[PDB]
Design a protein around this ligand. Structure first.
Ligand SMILES: CC(=O)N[C@@H](CCC(=O)O)C(=O)O
Ligand SMILES: CC(=O)N[C@@H](CCC(=O)O)C(=O)O
Ligand SMILES: CC(=O)N[C@@H](CCC(=O)O)C(=O)O
Ligand SMILES: CC(=O)N[C@@H](CCC(=O)O)C(=O)O
Ligand SMILES: CC(=O)N[C@@H](CCC(=O)O)C(=O)O
Ligand SMILES: [Cl-]
Ligand SMILES: [Cl-]
Ligand SMILES: [Cl-]
Ligand code: NA
Ligand code: NA
Ligand code: NA
Ligand code: NA
Ligand code: NA
Lengths: 287, 109, 286, 108, 111, 284, 289, 284
């Protein structure tokens, strides 16, 4: 007997163990692909990030934005070019990359978090030398960078005070030249720097499948040697290789867990953190 | 022309302000003040007090003679809890008013 | 794929989580919520939830029924005058042992195993509450709250602990006094400048027409509450509860809630839902 | 009916309060204030230092009183607040038209 | 004999003080105060932000003066405290019956 | 022994160093100072100097010319209504990309390589500046400063970082707005309770006679500034600059400077010299 | 068994220890307390005791007799104009060397070896005291306290050090001035908002009838003290001491004590006993009419 | 329309200001720098400059000549065993009064009026320096540094004060001892883990050939310095100075400088110029 309607409450109460498990922990999310393209997914990502902060965790958003860049390159008469995964980026292209990622996309994210009620602060690597860039090993592709160093001093106090850093993947040379860095690898390095509990890559895939020709042979949990074996067996292929490499490289530096998850589904973040639903593969440095 | 000082419970500020603005009252100052106004004890942050000074707010407005009675009613209604410590209102004469940026004057009573 | 959407019931909670971020909530835990196992477990889970989610719950409690049981075991007969327990020297000793020793540690213990970090006090610990004798005379060592000193518990609150406070407090000379738990809860709330005081009660809240259940008044202010008392609409043991709310609100507590502790998860229902589990009384309205 | 404002040395609050309560004075407010009053080319000592024209921490004490009570209340304040050193303060007397208790509505 | 209360912008204290001392004004108190003077259609700027009806930090300056001195003291305050921007403040003039110096007992009930 | 000296000059700077120890200085960096390479390099060196010597520089900037160049590259036409840029949805997107993305990071980058530690924001970062639509209508997404929240930048200032702030800020609902950089600089100054607001300008300062370029007024106060406006002595695009100074001074900024950004090391010349590179406007 | 109801005494001190917990006490150390070895040792032990027990002692001192000895060794003849030392350029140099160099470091040194942690300043250190010329002209570089800045010693006090302050302070242009140590002690007390100013003196306190001990007045207030001066009951070199107490009390120091430094452990006797080693002057104004 | 373009010079000082930001510099002030009025005024100006510009100067001093003058006024004859002052009970009293009371307060006083905030200690204050008797017997109360405790001064340094330390320190039992000011400076430097120890000296530095004015060795390391001693190229009163530098470097002080205090602004010349005012000895 006898009143009331929603029990949001029982579900709320059931979230306790998960809330308890990651209290105060740092979570670095690489936001891109479909989660960034489609409006519904994008709104949910912003709501989940705000949720995480509000509930006592420390979300960090890292992003790039290939499609958005392509659109602007088109508007200026430049034709998009790629060399095995990485964007071929000349002086002219680099200017646009910078303007799009730092100026437009970054402030779209900060802006949305702000109106959802979080307090977001947008950086690129060059702000406070958060990320120092060096040229990527791959020659002949212009100003594509590798992360030479990360200095988290600029964002740590902000994190302690409850702000949500939103970090674009562009970073300056030690001489001031901007470089285009792959956002996954920036996310992994920030995670390593922050000694993060989780690195989460929002991805256009279901995770890692053991058999591609068998939709949900989804591998829930892998460790490093196991991941290596999958690469060597070609089970992990194409554009999944750099993603796995990025996870391994981050885990080896002490990040507790790396998640390659399906950003194509609404609320992917909350689904990963607070559910046992199979939205992706966790890769760990342990067991 | 009259000055109205109202000593009030700090949490009541916003409610009293809203009542006054709605009654057409335009200018207003608050200051922090400690007080006691003792009939037989007052509660404050959980404790009982008899003769000690307790944190209150002093709200000051200047008003036309004709506005006095309804402004008082408005303050009393907005600031009352019925518990000891509700505060007091004082009415005193004001001869002249000058806006600093325009130099514009005023003389009523 | 996937089965639970706990997730979107989670996402919908956001505005409520945002609304009370960092805010202090003083809950008076008693009655059925304390008697039945079902409700007791939920109360502990709710308190732990509030802390975990960034709010600052404070539990205040008494335990009339548990006292009665012990008095019976020692050959003392329970006695009451107008709501308050007639407590002589002998009775007071038992009251103290039950409330401070047994009931308090049951609450602390349970929060601890639920994964919170509770610390149990009574008024005499760090002079949290200084007692004076209650105005009603001829009822023995029944107390009124003479002063509250929150210095002992706020650093603990800042650090995320859950204070659990029993309603017993010492005289300035060391004599224990039995204080009504509602009134202790109200005064702690006032001291902490709390966002909410919430009384877990054995009633639906305040009914406008006691003969009709649907008449539950969701929101009241002070003069309105006074008007209900004067009209006899609020009566019996609801009067001291309303008085305690008013007294607390007047000292700057933002809102007081008289809610139905007989229903599982009453706390979460109040904080995070628009369900009618009780009456909110505010110092500002209507 | 009169308002009495007394600017006084902060440490004197308790002594002045005690004098006033004993004189039957019931309601009272204090606020923190900074002031300077001195002459004639003569300095006030504050926290060990000499000052001429700068604002020094004082207390403003306000009471409302019956016309007949004014003179003895002044005497009472002067005697309680005086040290004889520069910086002792000032008392101002001004008219009050009306008094209202907020909880009762009682005019005076 | 009159009391003059001037609500002013905090940074203006020193300039107003200097103007008053030079006008021969001897005693003076300041207190911290919050205020709003809300001319409708018009917001006040304070530490960068726009405000309509909220209380903003100001200073309350109080002097007691001879009836004859009132007009020139007002002029002096107005000239020293004015910026021309909304939020400049207000001056109030009210009667004072009597003045007593605490250390000497010297009472001023001017004529 | 002994070549340059170099030390006497250094020793003579002491009283100026002493005077602004720990003080906050908000510099609006624009016009020629931003266009020409020599001036640009000197501005960055001066900002780094101020920090390094214990002051707290804050750089605020826009970048009209560089916006124009990009608008051109995308087939959009530059358009202005009485000083303010007419900025539609499409234009706003480019304004944002140029100012926040390109110009801001050019400044941050250069300070970094000069040896300072710069951090670049726009109004929307941490809600540093909340925008509202400008009173002037039919000019699109031109903003006014609705509120400033300095909480995000002052701990950074405490720690010795140089905030570099672009004049773009979001609406309460997330819509970007284009705000005039002088007015942003004025409001940041007011929020920070800054010692100085300095506008780097393409003029000598305020002249008493426009035909007589030696007629520079070194110091003005508010009423004086108002009279010059009313007499037409201050005119054209100098009016909004003076208004911005007055508005800032009234909120408690100690001094505002309209100085000649066309001259190398304008900043140091103002702070550490008695050279006439501009007009100081004060609240007294 | 004992011999050990040393405890009973220790336990009885409790209320006094409670009363002044954390409070600041400025002691002007001079006269016989400074001359005789037994008294000197006890003063240093009492100061160390106060700190160790949670209070905050500050020692202020001069040293007229010491100065005289050095003036003599350099062929200079001691000279006084009604209380204050006539101090020319030459004399000033010696005053500085004696008070700051010799006497101050004797005090600091002894506290250190008794187990406290003393730090010695003069007014010029950190501009603790800024001097201005005394109103009395024709007496050379005698100073008055122009300002006190306690920022330099506050943190040291917070950290449990015992500042030892000599009464010499520089002009705003750098010239040293010789200030009376009582008046320096009174102004430091005011600056620190001290609980007590204590003057170690060569008198029993203030006697009601000077040609008869012990008409010792235990407690006085301001108007009462003024009355005693006007009646000549307080006379000679007691006047400036009382003036210094009044001046300090009016600035908010809770109590001033003129006590007998001629008796061993004068300090503890005052703080922890009800023994009559002096007169307490308090800031009230009750005198009847 | 410029004039005293002190500004290029000021801008050029940037790299130096950057290089020693926040670093601690312990300066032993003595000799001609202390005797002549012009040099003295410049020393005080340079110390105040260093603090004001973000560094942490510490001044350590003795004052042999000043002591001699006073000993003369009291009928005591000055006496020296090789380098060190023979100081009996009587002499020690005067040494203390001069160094602690007169000289120390002259320095503190002058810094104060130049606009710094100086605080004067001797070793006995806060047990900054605990003395033990020097190894050399029969010379009375000459001390060596037994221990340094920097706890008393480092909060003061953190707050921007300039400690001025005289070289007198007490025994563990309270007896004053006279310590050589170079060695006290070196030990303070070691305690503070100082960036530099600078000795103001009455020599051009270390000459590679005492009779070649431009033979000034600009930079030495430890073994090199040792080699110069063993070859007699460093001799007389330069030996203890070099020893004191070596002793200090071995404890972790980055660089020790023996410089020419006879030249105005020696300090600034060393820190902010590449002029040859002395020899730097490093631990590298
Ligand atoms: C080097 C490189 O390819 N950078 C990416 C950045 C975008 C992202 O990582 O999402 C690019 O498209 O230019
Ligand atoms: C005085 C009094 O009646 N105390 C209550 C305490 C329990 C409660 O109120 O919850 C009692 O039962 O003794
Ligand atoms: C509104 C407006 O015109 N903004 C400027 C940018 C900032 C500035 O240059 O001051 C513009 O040129 O678009
Ligand atoms: C001015 C003056 O008389 N100074 C004292 C020293 C300080 C003191 O002992 O009071 C003196 O005898 O010279
Ligand atoms: C021991 C010794 O000779 N001390 C030095 C004082 C300090 C110094 O100047 O080095 C002296 O000449 O007495
Ligand atoms: Cl009341
Ligand atoms: Cl006076
Ligand atoms: Cl206005
Ligand atoms: Na999971
Ligand atoms: Na609800
Ligand atoms: Na200038
Ligand atoms: Na006593
Ligand atoms: Na050099």
């Amino acid at each position: 007997i006898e009143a009331g309607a929603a029990d949001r409450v029982r579900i709320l109460s059931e979230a306790l163990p998960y809330l308890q498990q990651f209290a105060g922990r740092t979570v670095v999310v690489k936001y891109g692909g479909a989660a960034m393209k489609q409006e519904e997914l994008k709104e949910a990502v912003m709501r989940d990030i705000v949720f995480l902060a509000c509930v006592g965790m420390r979300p960090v958003v890292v992003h790039g934005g290939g499609p958005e860049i392509n659109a602007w390159l088109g508007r200026v008469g430049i034709e998009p070019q790629f060399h095995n995964g990485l964007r071929v980026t000349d002086a002219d292209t680099m200017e646009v990359v910078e303007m799009v990622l730092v100026g437009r996309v970054n402030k779209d994210i900060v802006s949305r978090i702000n109106t959802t009620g979080g307090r977001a602060v947008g950086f690129c690597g060059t702000d406070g030398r958060l990320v120092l860039a060096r040229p990527h090993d791959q020659e002949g592709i212009g100003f594509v960078g590798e992360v030479n160093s990360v200095n988290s001093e600029v964002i740590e106090p902000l994190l302690e005070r409850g702000y949500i850093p939103v970090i674009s993947s562009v970073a300056a040379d030690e001489n001031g030249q901007s470089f285009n860095i792959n956002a996954d690898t920036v996310a992994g390095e920030i995670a390593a720097a922050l000694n993060a509990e989780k690195l989460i890559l929002l991805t256009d895939t279901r995770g890692i499948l053991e058999d591609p020709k068998r939709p949900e042979s989804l591998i829930p949990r892998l460790n490093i040697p196991q991941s290596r074996e999958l690469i060597a067996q070609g089970i992990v292929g194409g554009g999944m290789i750099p993603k796995v490499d990025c996870c391994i490289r981050s885990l080896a530096q002490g990040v507790r867990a790396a998640h390659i998850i399906d950003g194509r589904i609404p609320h992917a973040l909350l689904l990963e953190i607070f559910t046992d639903a199979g939205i992706g593969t966790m890769i760990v440095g342990s067991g | 022309m009259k000055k109205i000082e109202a000593i009030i419970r700090p949490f009541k500020l916003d409610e009293v302000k809203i009542a006054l603005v709605n009654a057409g009252i335009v200018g207003m100052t608050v200051s922090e003040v400690r007080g006691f106004g003792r009939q037989k004890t007052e509660r404050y942050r959980g404790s009982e007090y008899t003769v000690e000074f307790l944190q209150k707010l002093k709200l000051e407005i200047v008003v036309e003679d004709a506005q006095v009675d309804t402004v008082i009613d408005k303050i009393v209604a907005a600031a009352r809890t019925g518990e000891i410590g509700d505060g007091k209102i004082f009415v005193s004469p004001v001869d002249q008013t000058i806006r600093i940026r325009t130099g514009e004057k005023n003389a009523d009573a």
